[PDB]
Point group: C2
Chain length 51, copies 2
């Protein structure tokens, strides 16, 4: 039984190499939206015309 | 020259018979409208979809 003192734990060793790149399916922080104001009527039936 | 006094003119004689009926191309006083609020965008291009 090895005692676990306040100095035994050490920080994790992160791997080295080239910096990582974005791999999400779509932009998250830099996304820009073109917005329109849909009224109460004409419910959403087709997305192509909205685009 | 026949003088035209204040009693010479007589009222016009309207024809008699059955009462006249409406003959306009569309209703004028009794017309009823179904109304929608078109926003600034999506300008009027097709009337069938609006109907």
């Amino acid at each position: 039984i090895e005692p676990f003192l306040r100095t035994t734990p050490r920080p994790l060793r992160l791997p080295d190499g080239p910096p990582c790149s974005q791999r999400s399916k779509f932009l998250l922080m830099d996304a820009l939206k073109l917005s329109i104001e849909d009224p109460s009527h004409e419910g959403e039936g087709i997305p192509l015309y909205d685009a």
